[PDB]
């Protein structure tokens, strides 16, 4: 009464976005709306859990640099991300190279998540910049070139 609405089991569109419409995803992937115009998706929505996981990975990296993946989906004009997944990469705070460890790690973690019950796919990647703002460098630009031109749904 004091909170009026409260919540036993009812929800709204806020809880609706957490689902997997297989037919809808298949038809948007087949139609490929963003392949026809450059000025497609401008809204990216990322869940809290992914945010805190990314922040903890960056902090655990310390003064050095870390790097990991992300999981989600695309819906119409907007992009949805709701999972973060770190990688065991090492290197100097000015450059990091993904060795064979990460190559064997992303596939293994994806298979483990599929066994768990997860159904999302790779959507992008996150990289920590220790101090020098937030801007893509030349190598980052080339990598994003190749990633978005081979794996059209992507974001850095």
């Amino acid at each position: 009464t004091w909170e009026l609405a409260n919540n036993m089991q009812e929800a709204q569109s806020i809880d609706e976005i957490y689902k997997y419409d297989k037919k809808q995803q298949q038809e948007i992937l087949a139609a490929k709306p963003w392949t026809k115009d450059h000025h497609y998706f401008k809204y990216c929505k990322i869940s809290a859990l992914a945010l805190l996981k990314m922040v903890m990975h960056a902090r655990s990296g310390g003064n050095l640099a870390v790097m990991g993946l992300m999981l989600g989906k695309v819906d119409g004009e907007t992009m949805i991300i709701m999972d973060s997944f770190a990688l065991p990469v090492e290197g100097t705070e000015t450059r990091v190279n993904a060795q064979a460890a990460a190559y064997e790690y992303m596939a293994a973690y994806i298979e483990n998540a599929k066994q768990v019950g997860r159904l999302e796919n790779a959507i992008g990647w996150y990289h920590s910049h220790p101090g020098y703002g937030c801007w893509l460098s030349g190598i980052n630009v080339s990598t994003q070139m190749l990633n978005q031109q081979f794996q059209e749904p992507f974001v850095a």
Binding site: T92, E93, T94, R95, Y132
Partner: protein, 367 residues
């Protein structure tokens, strides 16, 4: 590569270093230019630069240069052919110091001409050169100079202090030269010797010829032990000599080592005669061509990603700022030099990892 040998060719052309008396005309200078072209084609120029600097120091400190204009133009020719700027700056400083030393010697001769010193004022010459360019070592070795020169060093020091107060003069006895007069019976022949050789020869002068031992000579000359032996090699193993002035060696052996307690003695009737016929007014030069004066690849890999780190931190930077940040970062590792940082600088710009600004010659841009 040939390197030093090629430098020897320069020593045969620019000046009469030793057997370089074969000079015809200025056309040889043109040949020297061809040699410079070789220096452009060949690699490992550090050894060639060091040999050229040593030859220039030997020629200038002895005043045996065949020509002066050619030597002056050699610096410009080397700069045009391409060489490190440090060598060119050092050569320019050496030439300027040599030019100033003539005026200093003239002033010393003109001013101090009443005290009479020991020798005539027209027989003593003083050449003071900057130690930051004309020398690299900083080790002092006693020579126990004779009483004749014991009254000349203080006068030069006093004159230098009076004229240019604020600087300290450290006399270098290894590069000094002089002429002494012998009285070896048949012929009195002048001999050119350095300071150590002069001390060794004058040690056995207070008691006729006589005979002295190695220990006595070492205790008298007070030289730096092993170096003294080297001086003996100059007075016992003179190349192309019919009869050495100090014709002794006791138990034969060789002048290289194993002196032990050999009793060296001067030969009063030594056959030191020019052309082996009447040494009435001969002169012998005994100085000769003496001119006494973290692995790299694993270490160079350290700094390049340090520069790239400084660049990825901030896009816009100047040369001085880059040097300051680089040396600020690399203090925990080895202390950086100047040549390594420069080498990395053009290694970076040649790989086009950075862009040189057109409006400003010093401003750099990341990629």
């Amino acid at each position: 590569k040939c390197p030093e040998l090629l430098a020897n060719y320069c020593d045969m052309l620019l000046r009469k270093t030793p057997l370089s008396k074969k000079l015809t005309s200025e056309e040889i200078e043109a040949k020297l230019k061809e040699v410079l072209l070789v220096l452009k084609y060949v690699q490992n120029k550090d050894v060639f630069m060091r040999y050229h600097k040593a030859h220039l120091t030997r020629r200038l400190i002895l005043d045996i240069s065949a020509d002066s204009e050619i030597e002056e133009n050699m610096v410009e020719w080397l700069r045009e052919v391409g060489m490190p700027a440090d060598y060119v700056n050092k050569l320019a400083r050496m030439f300027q110091d040599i030019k100033v030393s003539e005026d200093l010697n003239q002033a010393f001769k003109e001013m101090h001409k009443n005290n009479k010193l020991a020798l005539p004022a027209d027989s003593v010459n003083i050449k003071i050169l900057n130690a930051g360019a004309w020398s690299r070592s900083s080790e002092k070795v006693f020579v126990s100079l004779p009483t004749e020169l014991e009254d000349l060093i203080p006068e030069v020091e006093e004159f230098y202090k009076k004229n240019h107060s604020g600087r300290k003069l450290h006399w270098h006895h290894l590069m000094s030269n002089g002429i002494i007069t012998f009285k070896n019976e048949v012929g009195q022949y002048d001999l050119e010797v350095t300071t150590f050789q002069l001390a060794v020869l004058f040690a056995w002068n207070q008691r006729p010829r006589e005979k002295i031992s190695f220990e006595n000579l070492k205790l008298a000359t007070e030289l730096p032990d092993a170096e003294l032996r080297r001086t003996l090699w100059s007075l016992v193993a003179f190349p192309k000599l019919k009869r050495q002035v100090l014709l002794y060696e006791p138990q034969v052996n060789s002048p290289k080592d194993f002196t032990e307690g050999t009793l060296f003695s001067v030969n009063q009737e030594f056959s030191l005669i020019k052309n082996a016929k009447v040494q009435k007014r001969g002169k012998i030069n005994l100085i000769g061509r003496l001119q006494l004066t973290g692995i790299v690849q694993l270490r160079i890999l350290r700094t390049q990603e340090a520069i790239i780190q400084i660049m990825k931190m901030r896009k816009k930077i100047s040369n001085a700022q880059l040097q300051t940040e680089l040396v600020e970062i690399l203090k925990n590792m080895f202390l950086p030099q100047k040549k390594m940082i420069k080498e990395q600088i053009e290694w970076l710009i040649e790989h086009k990892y950075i862009r040189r600004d057109e409006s400003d010659i010093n401003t750099f841009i990341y990629m």
